[PDB]
Amino acid sequence: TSIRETLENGETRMKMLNEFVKKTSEEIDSLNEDVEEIKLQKEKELHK
Amino acid sequence: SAHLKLKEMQKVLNAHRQRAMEARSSLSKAQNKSKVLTALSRLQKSGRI
């Protein structure tokens, strides 16, 4: 019973860590897109 | 009568004026929402907030 509880807690922690890693990857992709947009804006609008 | 006609047509201008403002106001509101929507599409997508 103790080993089953530990395995269930470990599986829940692994699922939470996977969800957090997916959210972090989505946030990193969004930040990269925003940085690319900012670089394109600084390249185009500064040409004058 | 000349200046009478003048005031007449200038009254029309006033009407046009305000009605134009009306349209302009609406347009502004519209475009306002538009750019507001841009924030709703951008600020929430970047995830920084």
UniProtKB/Swiss-Prot annotation, chain A:
Note: Present with 3290 molecules/cell in log phase SD medium.
Localization of this protein: Nucleus; Cytoplasm; Chromosome
UniProt domain comment: The flexible SMC hinge domain, which separates the large intramolecular coiled coil regions, allows the heterodimerization with SMC4, forming a V-shaped heterodimer.
Quaternary assembly: Forms a heterodimer with SMC4. Component of the condensin complex, which contains the SMC2 and SMC4 heterodimer, and three non SMC subunits that probably regulate the complex: BRN1, YCS4 and YCG1/YCS5.
Protein name stated in the entry: Structural maintenance of chromosomes protein 2
Designated gene of the protein: SMC2
Tree of life domain: Eukaryota
Stated family: Belongs to the SMC family. SMC2 subfamily.
Biological role stated in the UniProt entry: Central component of the condensin complex, a complex required for conversion of interphase chromatin into mitotic-like condense chromosomes. The condensin complex probably introduces positive supercoils into relaxed DNA in the presence of type I topoisomerases and converts nicked DNA into positive knotted forms in the presence of type II topoisomerases.
Swiss-Prot record, chain B:
Superkingdom field: Eukaryota
Subcellular location: Nucleus; Cytoplasm; Chromosome
Family, similarity comment: Belongs to the SMC family. SMC4 subfamily.
Subunit structure comment from the entry: Forms a heterodimer with SMC2. Component of the condensin complex, which contains the SMC2 and SMC4 heterodimer, and three non SMC subunits that probably regulate the complex: BRN1, YCS4 and YCG1/YCS5.
Function (record text): Central component of the condensin complex, a complex required for conversion of interphase chromatin into mitotic-like condense chromosomes. The condensin complex probably introduces positive supercoils into relaxed DNA in the presence of type I topoisomerases and converts nicked DNA into positive knotted forms in the presence of type II topoisomerases.
Domain description: The flexible SMC hinge domain, which separates the large intramolecular coiled coil regions, allows the heterodimerization with SMC2, forming a V-shaped heterodimer.
UniProt miscellaneous comment: Present with 573 molecules/cell in log phase SD medium.
Protein name (Swiss-Prot/TrEMBL): Structural maintenance of chromosomes protein 4
Protein species of origin: Saccharomyces cerevisiae (strain ATCC 204508 / S288c)
Native organism taxonomy: Eukaryota, Fungi, Dikarya, Ascomycota, Saccharomycotina
Whole-protein coverage range: 637 to 685 of 1418
